Amino acid sequence: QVQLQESGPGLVKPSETLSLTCTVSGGSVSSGGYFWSWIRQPPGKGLEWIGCIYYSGSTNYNPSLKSRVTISVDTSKDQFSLKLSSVTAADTAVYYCARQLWLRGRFDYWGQGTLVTVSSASTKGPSVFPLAPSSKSTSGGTAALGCLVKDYFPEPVTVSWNSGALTSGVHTFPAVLQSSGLYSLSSVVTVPSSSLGTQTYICNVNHKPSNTKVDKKVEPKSCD
Amino acid sequence: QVQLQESGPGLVKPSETLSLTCTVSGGSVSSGGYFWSWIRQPPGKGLEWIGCIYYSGSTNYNPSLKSRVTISVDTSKDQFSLKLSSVTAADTAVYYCARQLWLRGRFDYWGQGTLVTVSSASTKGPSVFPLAPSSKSTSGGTAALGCLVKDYFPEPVTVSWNSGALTSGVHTFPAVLQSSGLYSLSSVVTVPSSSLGTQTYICNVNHKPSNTKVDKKVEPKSCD
Amino acid sequence: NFMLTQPHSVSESPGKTVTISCTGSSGSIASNYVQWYQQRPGSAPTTVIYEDNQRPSGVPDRFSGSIDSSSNSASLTISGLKTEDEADYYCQSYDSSNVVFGGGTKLTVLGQPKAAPSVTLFPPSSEELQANKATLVCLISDFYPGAVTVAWKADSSPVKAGVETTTPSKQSNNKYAASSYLSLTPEQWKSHRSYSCQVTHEGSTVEKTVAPT
Amino acid sequence: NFMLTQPHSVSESPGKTVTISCTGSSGSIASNYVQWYQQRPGSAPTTVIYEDNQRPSGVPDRFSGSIDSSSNSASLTISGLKTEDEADYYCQSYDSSNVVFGGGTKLTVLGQPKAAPSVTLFPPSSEELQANKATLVCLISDFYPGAVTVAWKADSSPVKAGVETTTPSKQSNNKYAASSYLSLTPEQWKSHRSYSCQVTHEGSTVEKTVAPT
Amino acid sequence: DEVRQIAPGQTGKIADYNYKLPDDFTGCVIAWNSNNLDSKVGGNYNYLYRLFRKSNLKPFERDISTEPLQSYGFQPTNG
């Protein structure tokens, strides 16, 4: 059959230009006489239509989004791209590219939704701090250790333990808004205290927006 | 019975405070246990509810207009006033004050609607020029004469002939945008040419925005 | 997030029966009182019905309303339309301490002869010339249809720069009115020997001319 | 100015019948094709019906749609509900040159065991202190119900400035877990003799303490 | 207001007196707005319609009996 895949960055700054490209595999753009469009959906809100295109220069746009949508089709690369201008804080939505069998009817297939939102200027790399276990950090035969992800922007970050080898007892907590713009979270794993001084535990925090693969080793606290 | 009359300046500048006062004649604000409200209506659009007040401190506002409406009631002067903050160019509407016999019901009496204007945070006086009739300005037994209202800002102007004594044949034309910001219009009256040199025609152009009143006499053209 | 859905334009010949709807979005229409207002253009709105079945003292009996709570709509029925019925209609709600009005329904229809496009011209005044300004005013009045094209003429040369015209507007004598303005410098007004305004209306052309005298 | 009106929340027990409405504002609902998309949370939308009576190949027979042009409403009828129907249904009317999607309708049908609030504490690291920051992290995990109140303490005085906490979240243990963060300056961390985090859960209080060592 | 009346399975004023739609209707109806050409300003009354009929009519049949005919109210300045 045919399938549509989106690409491009998941981030854009306010008052900038958005570049989202949706590619076509298993089919041809020009043949068949069908249509393309872009459909966005904010989290917790209904679907919103942006604009529709033909493989020729025929275009039509939402009057709410009029004079801000620039969509172009290149047949040689077998894809179509949409450009959005003057993006704001209210444009955080999940974008979908879909094939239009009937222009005034329905869409046969929907591509997977990329979380393309706006990203404020507060963008900064994360600051990973180890969480050293101690005698007061354990309750019984098991202890806890982890790493703190503080002062980063934007969502999300992926934290893995021992390159994904340690999954049991690993808890990932959702981020919360700090007092000044940024977020903070942590990821911890419950481990018996017998292997505290004999096993090495390292937290792998990845921040794809700010290209940050900080690896921090977790050790028991040393009194100074 | 009771009646409602509004006052205050029609002109309002962007990003400052509006001041509209509605007075009560033939009744008392406190007695009767009724309600007061302000309802605005844009030209060509539906009625919009702003807020309602009691003669005590009870207030409720539209969520679209929330944190922008400040309405106060003074019983000593037997009136109530509303203050609007951070007004933009989309707030051009005809404001009405109405007595509320029933809060969730209807308004029995509606006051006369005052027209406001907010365009560009600028204010320029009009330039009234006479339109002298001549032999080429008449077609048959009747002639035409008037005055030109040019380079004024902002809307509107009221033009009357002989302090409103002449109404037959008087045509008021809508204003159009000029090449540079300002507007222009004219008002003319059709009269038989027999009374051209025996009667005096004076145009009364009033401009409450730019607080400029101008009376210009209309006379037949003298060749020089 | 409760809004009242009202048809934008409803037209019916006089003497017949028409129904005006008012549909609620989220809250049920029978929950709160629905009130209709009949507002003349350039005039304050007036209550035409209230309590969904009660008519005020003074309005005719034809203004009757009905409520169908199954479809969440408020229906206003008008029987025997007249000339004065041509007005905007808005339905009012209360929701929860937030009065919400309707979209707005106006009576549209209620046969129009043509008229001759009388054209008058005036030269710029001497007072305007003393202010280093000059403006020619061309007027089109008492005409029908309201579709005219204006073309200024400086001697035999047409002018497009500084030309400002007004859209046709209906008059009191059931005709249309229009205007045209030509802003000029004082040197340009005396540069040309004469200025002419040509008005085209239904093929026929009415031409007037002025000269600096 | 054509907008589709859809109820925000619809809930019905499984095995029964339910009607989902979609009312058009200005244009009649029978003028243009109305389509419903069934979208799972965190997944791409999928067409569940089209042409107002036509089912796609693959969906069951229960997804039936009807059009009531008199009331300007599109009705989608579902019979025999079950678990996987918990999705979002948007009524879609592209009309002409513009898809108007509906607001959407979700589904709500209905074992978390009670547990003890295990609490762990860590002091700020030396690397954070070298980077002129200090943060105390309080963690609450393996508990139920997910309604806990955190209260930081500096020896004996409660601390509220810089306190950031996380809402309880679901995990694989069928219990809840939360977090609490206390941002501090390096001098404030060493000013007090000890810092403790107190967690209140179902009346019982579990308190851990840390000291600068 | 009568574009919704062109459908099988309802009774009105035009769909039963001018052109009936049967149950086995595989037609494909198209309508659009061209009010700038067919609506002369001031009231265009060239087209007519039938309002009164003695009884029902078989579908796909034309009724031209003048023994009920009323004018329109078309005007390009409406909504």
Q: How many CB atoms lie within 10 A of CB D117?
A: 21
- Say whether residue D179 is in contact with chain A using an 8 A CB cutoff: yes
Residues linked to residue B102 through DSSP beta bridges, in sequence order: none
D126 φ, ψ to 5°? -70, -30
Residue of C nearest to D69 (CA): C71
In the sheet that holds C46-49, the strands lie side by side as C9-10, C105-107, C88-92, C35-39, C46-49
Residue A63's Cβ-count burial label (10 Å; 0-12, 13-18, 19+) is exposed
Using a CB-CB cut-off of 8 Å, the residues of chain C touching E41 are 112, 145-146
Chain E, 39-58: which have a CB under 8 Å from a chain C CB? 41-43
Which of C122, C139, C210 to probe by mutation at the B interface, max B CB count within 10 Å? C122
If you count them, how many residues does chain D have?
A: 213
Whole-angstrom distance, CA of residue B202 vs CA of residue E16: 65
Sign of CA dihedral B177, B183, B189, B190: negative
From B24, E32, A113, A5, select the one nearest D46 (Cα to Cα).
A113
Using a CB-CB cut-off of 8 Å, the residues of chain A touching D183 are 150, 178-179
* Termini Cα distance of chain B: 62
3-state secondary structure chain B: CCEEEEECCCECCCCCCEEEEEEEECCCCCCCCCEEEEEEECCCCCCEEEEEECCCCCEEECHHHCCCEEEEEECCCCEEEEEECCCCHHHCCEEEEEEECCCCCCEEEECCCEECECCCCCCECCEEEEECCCHHHCCCCEEEEEEEEEEEECCCCEEEECCCCECCCEEECCCEECCCCCEEEEEEEEEEHHHCCCCCEEEEEEECCCCEEEEEEECCCCCC
Residue of D nearest to E1 (CA): D28
Chain D, 75-134: which have a CB under 8 Å from a chain A CB? 90, 92, 94-104, 118-128, 131, 133
3-state secondary structure of C172: coil
From B210, B88, B201, B121, select the one nearest B157 (Cα to Cα).
B210
Residue of C nearest to B188 (CA): C139
Tell me which residues of chain D have a C-beta less than 8 Å from any C-beta of chain C.
1, 5, 7-8, 23, 25-26, 71-73
From D94, D97, D84, select the one nearest D41 (Cα to Cα).
D84
Q: Which residue type occupies B45?
A: K
From C94, C81, C90, select the one nearest C8 (Cα to Cα).
C90
Whole-angstrom distance, CA of residue B163 vs CA of residue B152: 21
On whether the CB atoms of residues C175 and C145 are closer than 8 A, the answer is no
Helix (H) or strand (E) run with residue C190 in it = helix C186-191
Could you give the C-alpha distances from B47 to B69, C45, D42, in angstroms and in order? 17, 10, 41
* Virtual torsion, Cα B207, B208, B209, B211, nearest 10 deg: 80
Residue matched to tokens 């300045």: E77
From B119, B121, B129, select the one nearest B92 (Cα to Cα).
B119
Contacts of C185 (CB under 8 A, 6+ apart): C132, C134
Resolution (A): 8.4
Q: How far does the CA of residue D81 sit from the closest CA of chain E (Å)?
A: 30
| ∠ Cα A70 A74 A76 (to 5°) | 170
On whether the CB atoms of residues A112 and A143 are closer than 8 A, the answer is no
Q: Do A221 and D213 touch (CB under 8 A)?
A: yes
Rg of chain B, C-alpha, whole Å: 22
3-state secondary structure of A171: strand
Q: How far does the CA of residue B87 sit from the closest CA of chain C (Å)?
A: 21
Residue matched to tokens 């409602």: B4
From A113, A62, A65, select the one nearest A87 (Cα to Cα).
A65
Residue of E nearest to D71 (CA): E4
Q: Which residue type occupies D109?
A: V
* Termini Cα distance of chain E: 11
Whole-angstrom distance, CA of residue C99 vs CA of residue C92: 7
Whole-angstrom distance, CA of residue D35 vs CA of residue D51: 7
From A157, C129, D143, E46, select the one nearest B148 (Cα to Cα).
C129
Residues linked to residue A143 through DSSP beta bridges, in sequence order: A191
Whole-angstrom distance, CA of residue D124 vs CA of residue D115: 29
On whether the CB atoms of residues B97 and B79 are closer than 8 A, the answer is no
Q: How far does the CA of residue C88 sit from the closest CA of chain E (Å)?
A: 13
Residue E11's Cβ-count burial label (10 Å; 0-12, 13-18, 19+) is exposed
Residue of D nearest to A170 (CA): D171
Establish how many alpha carbons lie within 13 A of residue C73's alpha carbon, considering only the half-sphere containing its beta carbon: 20
From A171, A19, B150, select the one nearest A6 (Cα to Cα).
A19
Could you give the C-alpha distances from B42 to B89, B91, D114, in angstroms and in order? 12, 8, 59
Contacts of C104 (CB under 8 A, 6+ apart): B45, B46, B47, C6, C8, C88, C89, C90
Contacts of A139 (CB under 8 A, 6+ apart): D118, D119, D120
What single DSSP character describes residue C83?
Answer: G
Using a CB-CB cut-off of 8 Å, the residues of chain D touching C25 are 5, 23
3-state secondary structure of C87: coil
C126 φ, ψ to 5°? -70, -30
Q: How far does the CA of residue D79 sit from the closest CA of chain A (Å)?
A: 23
Whole-angstrom distance, CA of residue A113 vs CA of residue A39: 10
